[PDB]
Design an enzyme around this catalytic site. Structure first.
Site, PDB file in Angstrom:
ATOM      1  N   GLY A 281      -9.480  -4.082  -3.418  1.00 55.60           N
ATOM      2  CA  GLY A 281      -7.730  -5.595  -4.098  1.00 55.60           C
ATOM      3  C   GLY A 281      -6.941  -4.287  -4.899  1.00 55.60           C
ATOM      4  O   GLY A 281      -7.268  -3.230  -4.797  1.00 55.60           O
ATOM      5  N   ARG A 282      -6.334  -5.351  -5.453  1.00 54.05           N
ATOM      6  CA  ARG A 282      -5.506  -4.779  -7.111  1.00 54.05           C
ATOM      7  C   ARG A 282      -5.859  -4.769  -8.478  1.00 54.05           C
ATOM      8  O   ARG A 282      -5.299  -4.078  -9.300  1.00 54.05           O
ATOM      9  CB  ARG A 282      -4.090  -5.808  -7.654  1.00 54.05           C
ATOM     10  CG  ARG A 282      -3.229  -5.299  -5.562  1.00 54.05           C
ATOM     11  CD  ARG A 282      -1.970  -6.682  -5.990  1.00 54.05           C
ATOM     12  NE  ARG A 282      -1.990  -6.548  -7.512  1.00 54.05           N
ATOM     13  CZ  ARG A 282      -1.248  -7.721  -8.019  1.00 54.05           C
ATOM     14  NH1 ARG A 282      -1.382  -9.025  -7.403  1.00 54.05           N
ATOM     15  NH2 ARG A 282      -1.747  -7.503  -9.476  1.00 54.05           N
ATOM     16  N   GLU A 285      -6.145  -0.097  -8.883  1.00 60.61           N
ATOM     17  CA  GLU A 285      -5.189   0.302  -9.968  1.00 60.61           C
ATOM     18  C   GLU A 285      -5.590   0.508 -10.961  1.00 60.61           C
ATOM     19  O   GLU A 285      -5.180   1.244 -11.746  1.00 60.61           O
ATOM     20  CB  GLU A 285      -3.981  -0.394  -8.859  1.00 60.61           C
ATOM     21  CG  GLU A 285      -3.880  -1.220  -9.953  1.00 60.61           C
ATOM     22  CD  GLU A 285      -2.178  -1.460  -9.440  1.00 60.61           C
ATOM     23  OE1 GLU A 285      -1.922  -0.355  -8.783  1.00 60.61           O
ATOM     24  OE2 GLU A 285      -1.626  -2.770  -9.663  1.00 60.61           O
ATOM     25  N   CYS A 311     -12.264  -0.242  -0.064  1.00 60.48           N
ATOM     26  CA  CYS A 311     -10.205  -0.436   0.632  1.00 60.48           C
ATOM     27  C   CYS A 311     -10.146   0.145  -0.811  1.00 60.48           C
ATOM     28  O   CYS A 311      -9.849   2.139  -0.258  1.00 60.48           O
ATOM     29  CB  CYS A 311     -10.153  -1.973   0.141  1.00 60.48           C
ATOM     30  SG  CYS A 311      -8.653  -2.472   0.031  1.00 60.48           S
ATOM     31  N   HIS A 312      -9.254  -0.265  -1.900  1.00 61.06           N
ATOM     32  CA  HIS A 312      -8.855   0.375  -2.897  1.00 61.06           C
ATOM     33  C   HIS A 312     -10.014   1.067  -3.916  1.00 61.06           C
ATOM     34  O   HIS A 312      -9.245   1.490  -5.006  1.00 61.06           O
ATOM     35  CB  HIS A 312      -8.031   0.378  -3.880  1.00 61.06           C
ATOM     36  CG  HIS A 312      -6.775  -0.623  -2.784  1.00 61.06           C
ATOM     37  ND1 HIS A 312      -6.340  -1.228  -1.103  1.00 61.06           N
ATOM     38  CD2 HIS A 312      -5.379   0.064  -3.133  1.00 61.06           C
ATOM     39  CE1 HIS A 312      -5.185  -0.978  -1.059  1.00 61.06           C
ATOM     40  NE2 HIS A 312      -4.563  -0.120  -1.564  1.00 61.06           N
ATOM     41  N   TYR A 331      -9.059   2.385   2.174  1.00 57.52           N
ATOM     42  CA  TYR A 331      -7.434   2.336   3.120  1.00 57.52           C
ATOM     43  C   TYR A 331      -6.954   3.198   3.518  1.00 57.52           C
ATOM     44  O   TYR A 331      -6.371   3.871   2.517  1.00 57.52           O
ATOM     45  CB  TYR A 331      -7.155   1.123   2.250  1.00 57.52           C
ATOM     46  CG  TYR A 331      -5.728   0.181   2.338  1.00 57.52           C
ATOM     47  CD1 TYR A 331      -6.068  -0.736   3.491  1.00 57.52           C
ATOM     48  CD2 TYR A 331      -4.880   0.419   2.306  1.00 57.52           C
ATOM     49  CE1 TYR A 331      -5.145  -1.402   4.454  1.00 57.52           C
ATOM     50  CE2 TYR A 331      -3.348  -0.341   2.372  1.00 57.52           C
ATOM     51  CZ  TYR A 331      -3.490  -0.953   3.726  1.00 57.52           C
ATOM     52  OH  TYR A 331      -3.162  -1.642   4.594  1.00 57.52           O
TER      53      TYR A 331
END
Lengths: 387, 387, 387
Positions: A281-282, A285, A311-312, A331
């Site tokens: 997800g976000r 980061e 994913c991320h 991802y």
């Protein structure tokens, strides 16, 4: 293999209550088919995100779209070992679909396991297969279950589950851990080596599925699982993101369920955990800019302990410098980070395929949860046996 | 005209990060072509509204749909004087598109100017064109750039901008004013006559584009721009509206980015400003019922000073009675307001056409920002010159 | 028969401002046709949900899709006794549609009644048919009426209405009760025997139409109507849900208008009140668990007083055991609760029909409000006579 389960899907079923079982059961080695009346394999079901924002009832939102992999009116009940009934607002209308009630009745007689959660029970009531049966459900379904002749067990907490022979019931998704373990036991499954303690690195706007499924799946096994997040106490909650493809060149973003951290970040003794999991997800980061978060990752990689990122998530791994000379996937977009991190790219094809490299397990997107958890179990010594 | 720039778009790029540069530049006499791999001129891209509401990262919602005016596979880079790379979640996936990275590589070699903002830099890191180059970006991209051998400049504030020759980088859209001016100077532009103070009359639910585009374009020019709203102080913020035409008989509405006022409304003095701008949206209709707001409009008008209002903004003008015997345009529906106000209607066709009557500049919808800002510049004597 | 009225609809008209009169007038024996330029019967218009949430002007959200029952360019304006013009954002663009302005002017010419609310008045201003006419509208529509030469009446409070011969006008939907009554009288209708107190059992996420339409229809009739919600004061408000079918196997859900309660739940006296109304949506399922709520239903049913329930409201009756040996319909899915409750199911076909079993009136969904209200009216002895 060995066991095949059938999930009764429907429009606006609770996102969580359909994906967690669908993926967990798969990670444990059970084949799972999803159907919805009037729909064929490859068709989509919209889902609902049921949560509480301070009102006398739950608030609803749209979850990810769920694709069916099996066709209704083309299923042979005789060929299934168990049946799962998701909650949400689907049971309400499914409970009044001739073909659905006939199916739940037929299955109910075979004496085979049936796991129903939240509003799913409503279907059980319509099928009149709960008489004298101990059981629970969302508090709101009680009147209908009692009027059906059931031995109503009021849910004092969201997690309470009840078993009465082959009838397994839960009040909400908060009880997925026990809900799932029992349906497993009920399927003749035996879980071994599940006495581990996993640490989850969470953060704001982590992917809804990517946190809940892996997390609860590991809890259904019996592990002690904690989740933390920089600057947050064991009570705090993190908002989540629902990433899904709706036609454009990249996924769309929508609000998911609110997740609750279990431990305080400051009081974190990493040496006490056997593994570490990083949801996508976000959140990755910005978590990757956090010093403390990186050190935690370093410690796990140094100790050669199992680390599973999806994913991320790998963005935090690449920033810790722990990807150097390591093979892994992520991802598609975060291949940038893997390479720049010094890692060797593993094509994520199909998107549901995950890879293991020593102590490192990686996944591409939420569709890979089955293999994801399955491969993290292997590095852990956890097995699930049947027959 | 004299220069031609190319904007690298993608699905879910930050709404502001594309629309502000696309329109400010045209306003300065620069032809701008918008393109997106796998798409042709006339197609659209969905945008993203990234903003903060207190969480550990930004929040995201859907912005205006952005229509490209160029075709990717039909582009000749030897024809553009520069390249702009907007942010959002587009860079993320564009960076992994072979054709995209090739375009950046080649443009990078030619040494022409490249302006990249927020997440846009990830593309530069992918194309390996930041080795030994000073630059900034959203803090989150910092790692990737460092690994790409860049001389990283951490954004201490949201408006920091870096320039290392032909490379111009900004961290967030809050840096647009300098981001654009630096890009213009790099194209060999010279701005003169920007010694003006401009006042913006804002309000809750004003159009998102209709505020940021003119407000930031003017700042990029060098002007001093102030924004106010009745009963609100400098720090206050106003919710904006995103008006867009989908398939219905009128436009739809969605929340846009929150807008920050700059001055206390009570501490005003029409004396100290050289022009007055009035954004459209739903703010005007109620702002037009405010005494003080009307006086402000009157003062600017009889002082013959430059006044520009777009969309529904002309409602405040009609209500102040300053459109007596004058020519002007406005959102089609506001023709009633212009006529009943004593003005002479000017057909808003094409929708991007603005009209200047004496000291009064008027536009129809947000698409007319280029001609809107251009015409306001003309009354202020501001000019941009190239070669 | 007796009377036929035409309602001028449009994309993004205020949801309440169209349904409440559309349905209330039908429950009063008046035939109603809905029409929109460029659209034919069977088509639909999106509606808008307006109301404040702490900002300087209203907030907009999407409401139920409204399907028109007549074709605009086929209307024999001569066969209509009255005209209703809803507010919202539709008038804005309708006021600028030639056909529409001519229709309005042609109708104001015949002297026949015209009821307009909120922003609807902009159409009257465009037709220049309000000179020297006394009237009111939404505050922001005043400057226009004044300029169109009207005798403006500032809406001191949102519930103010104004009648000037054949022109009936209101400022916001808050004045619907008086608005509708005046229109009815102006149609030559007399209301008799409306001295009744009516109680509405409300809660969080009840169907938006299901509370407002019946609530306000009875108020317009002259009845005194109270709304309560467990553990909530007279000032508190309840969020509502907008349920609408959009293509999936079951309805979808969006947030609707906030509804304010009128009295305190704890000081409630069932002795007073001649009837009880139970709205649908998601509130019933949880209200059905409240002891106090079931007693109230108990009382009324024992008293033999009229009880009217629609959609999911029956879940509360069934739970109180008052359906034992009663014939009734409900939302298809809730048939389960009706049968488990010992009632005899009455198939809701067509969806818009309700039934009366002695003192019990039940409807399937909001599309049936017309028969729902006329049938409750019959039990209460309220009548509307024309000619």
């Amino acid at each position: 293999n060995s066991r095949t389960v059938l999930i009764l899907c429907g429009d606006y079923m609770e996102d969580y209550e359909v994906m967690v079982p669908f993926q967990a059961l798969q990670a444990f080695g059970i084949t799972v088919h999803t159907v919805c009346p009037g729909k064929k394999a490859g068709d989509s079901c919209p889902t609902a995100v049921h949560d509480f924002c301070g009102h006398q009832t739950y608030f609803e939102s749209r979850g990810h779209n769920f694709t069916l992999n099996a066709t209704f009116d083309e299923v042979d009940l005789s060929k299934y070992d168990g049946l799962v009934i998701p909650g949400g607002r689907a049971p309400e209308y499914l409970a009044l679909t001739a073909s659905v009630v006939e199916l739940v009745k037929e299955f109910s007689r075979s004496g085979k396991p049936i796991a129903s959660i939240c509003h799913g029970q409503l279907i059980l009531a319509a099928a009149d297969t709960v008489n004298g049966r101990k059981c629970t459900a969302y508090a709101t379904v009680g009147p209908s279950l009692v009027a059906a002749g059931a031995k109503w067990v009021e849910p004092i907490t969201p997690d309470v589950c009840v078993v009465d022979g082959s009838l397994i019931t839960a009040a909400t998704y908060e009880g997925h851990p026990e809900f799932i373990q029992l349906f497993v036991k009920a399927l003749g499954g035996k879980i071994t080596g599940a006495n581990k303690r996993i640490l989850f690195l969470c953060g704001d706007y982590m992917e809804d599925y990517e946190v809940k499924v892996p997390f609860q799946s590991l809890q259904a096994l019996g592990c002690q699982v904690d989740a933390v997040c920089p600057e947050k106490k064991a009570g705090e909650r993190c908002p989540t993101a629902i990433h899904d493809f709706e036609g454009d060149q990249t996924y769309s973003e929508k609000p998911g369920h609110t997740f609750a951290l279990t431990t305080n970040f400051d009081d974190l003794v990493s040496s006490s955990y056997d593994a570490l999991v990083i949801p996508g997800g976000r959140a990755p980061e910005y978590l990757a800019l956090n010093e403390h978060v990186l050190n935690i990752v370093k410690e796990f990689m140094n100790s050669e302990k199992p680390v599973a990122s999806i994913c991320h998530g790998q963005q935090i791994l690449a920033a810790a410098g722990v990807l150097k000379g390591r093979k892994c996937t992520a991802y598609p977009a975060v291949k940038l980070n893997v390479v720049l991190g010094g890692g060797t790219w593993l094509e994520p094809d199909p998107i549901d395929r995950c890879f293991t490299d020593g102590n490192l397990v990686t996944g591409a997107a939420w569709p890979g949860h089955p293999e994801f958890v399955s491969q993290l179990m292997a590095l852990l010594g956890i097995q699930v046996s049947f027959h």
